[PDB]
């Protein structure tokens, strides 16, 4: 499958060399524009095979709206214990930051939101004691299906998750479900409901009108939904969300990520969630790093002071 790519040894070694050079030699640190520039330049040193694979995915993300790359460099011997604080981010140069920011610059540009993880471009996904029930990075209860930052006009176009350390307990898996798999299975009444402006997705409290869930083309729509946050404004809308959830559940691909695996989710067409797990809280738990990609950074300029990578309020 061209949506499941394992790097061959030659390509894996080259990307490792490139990532280490960026991580150790580039001036500044990942959130600095000069480091993102070094990452952009380093991306273009990647093997053509992988650049072609990513370009193909950007053009058409396929029936599941997701790709996984396996065999990317991660510093397993050098990895510290899994962080255990909420809001954990990667401010220092590292191999994980190098891989994520290079790939972001290949697909578009990286971006982040000031009210979420303090606008860091590379964010940790790690379980935190006391946050078990949270619908977010720090939680370990079932994470309900959603588009990332569904409320936001400039929500991520892609969400990238690089696995540093697998969940040792075997119960955690990333779940992705694409509107392309479910649209043909939905009832006419549900489809009609999802095109109507009868859903309210209010911003989270940290970020300080009724609209449709389905967007764009009738046969190949985008979608905008968060099954935790999106509120139906009518009864048919409520029924539509229940049917949509059911079909997401039935058609979702579930992935237990392993070190060196990079999952890239097309957030225009694919929702994601996560199964429940019981953290150990002993430094050995699941550790992903996450970076958002904007396919056209220019569109959010009004929200990006100094033409930076951190989106805040407009106008
Ligand atoms: Na998410």
UniProtKB/Swiss-Prot annotation:
This is L-asparagine oxygenase. One of its GO terms (molecular function) is iron ion binding. L-asparagine binds at residues 116, 137, 148-149, 290. Disruption phenotype: S.coelicolor strain A3(2) / MT1110 and A3(2) / 2377 lacking asnO produce non-hydroxylated asparagine-containing CDA variants, which are not synthesized by the wild-types but retain calcium-dependent antimicrobial activity. Transmembrane segments: none annotated. 2-oxoglutarate binds at residue 286. Gene3D superfamilies: Clavaminate synthase-like (3.60.130.10). It catalyses: L-asparagine + 2-oxoglutarate + O2 = (2S,3S)-3-hydroxyasparagine + succinate + CO2. PANTHER family: GAMMA-BUTYROBETAINE HYDROXYLASE-RELATED (PTHR10696), TAUD_TFDA-LIKE DOMAIN-CONTAINING PROTEIN (PTHR10696:SF56). Binds 1 Fe(2+) ion per subunit. Fe cation binds at residues 146, 148, 272. Catalyzes the 3-hydroxylation of L-asparagine to (2S,3S)-3-hydroxyasparagine. The 3-hydroxylated asparagine produced is incorporated at position 9 during the biosynthesis of the non-ribosomally synthesized calcium-dependent antibiotic (CDA), a 11-residue acidic lipopeptide lactone. Is able to hydroxylate only free L-asparagine, since it hydroxylates neither a CDA analog with unmodified Asn at position 9 nor a peptidyl-carrier-protein (PCP)-bound asparagine. Is not active toward D-asparagine.
């Amino acid at each position: 499958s061209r949506y499941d790519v394992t790097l061959d040894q030659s390509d894996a070694e080259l990307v490792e060399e490139i990532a280490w050079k960026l991580a150790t030699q580039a001036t500044g640190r990942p959130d600095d524009a000069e480091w993102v520039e070094a990452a952009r330049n380093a991306w273009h040193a990647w093997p053509a095979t992988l650049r072609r694979d990513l370009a193909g995915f950007r053009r058409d993300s396929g029936p599941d709206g997701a790709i996984v790359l396996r065999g990317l460099p991660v510093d397993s011997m050098g990895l510290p214990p899994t962080p255990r604080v909420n809001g954990s981010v990667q401010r220092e140069a590292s191999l994980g930051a190098a891989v994520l920011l290079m790939t972001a610059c290949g697909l578009g540009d990286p971006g982040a939101f000031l009210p979420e993880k303090n606008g860091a471009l590379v964010q940790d996904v790690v379980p935190v004691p006391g946050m078990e029930e949270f619908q977010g990075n720090a939680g370990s209860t079932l994470l309900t299906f959603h588009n990332e930052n569904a409320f936001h006009e400039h929500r991520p176009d892609f969400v990238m998750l690089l696995c540093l350390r697998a969940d040792p307990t075997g119960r955690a898996g990333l779940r992705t479900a694409c509107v392309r798999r479910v649209l043909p299975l939905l009832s006419d009444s549900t489809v009609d409901a999802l095109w109507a402006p009868e859903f309210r997705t209010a911003p989270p409290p940290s970020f300080q009108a009724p609209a449709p869930v389905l967007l764009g083309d009738r046969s190949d729509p985008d979608l905008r939904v968060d099954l935790a946050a999106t509120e139906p404004v009518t009864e048919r809308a409520a029924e539509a969300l229940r049917e949509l959830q059911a079909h997401f559940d039935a058609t979702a691909v579930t992935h237990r990520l392993l070190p060196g695996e990079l999952a890239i989710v097309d957030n225009r067409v694919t929702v994601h969630g996560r199964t429940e797990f019981t953290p150990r809280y002993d430094g050995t738990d699941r550790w992903l790093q996450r970076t958002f990609v904007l396919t056209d950074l220019r569109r959010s300029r009004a929200m990006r002071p100094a033409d930076g990578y951190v989106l805040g309020a407009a106008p």
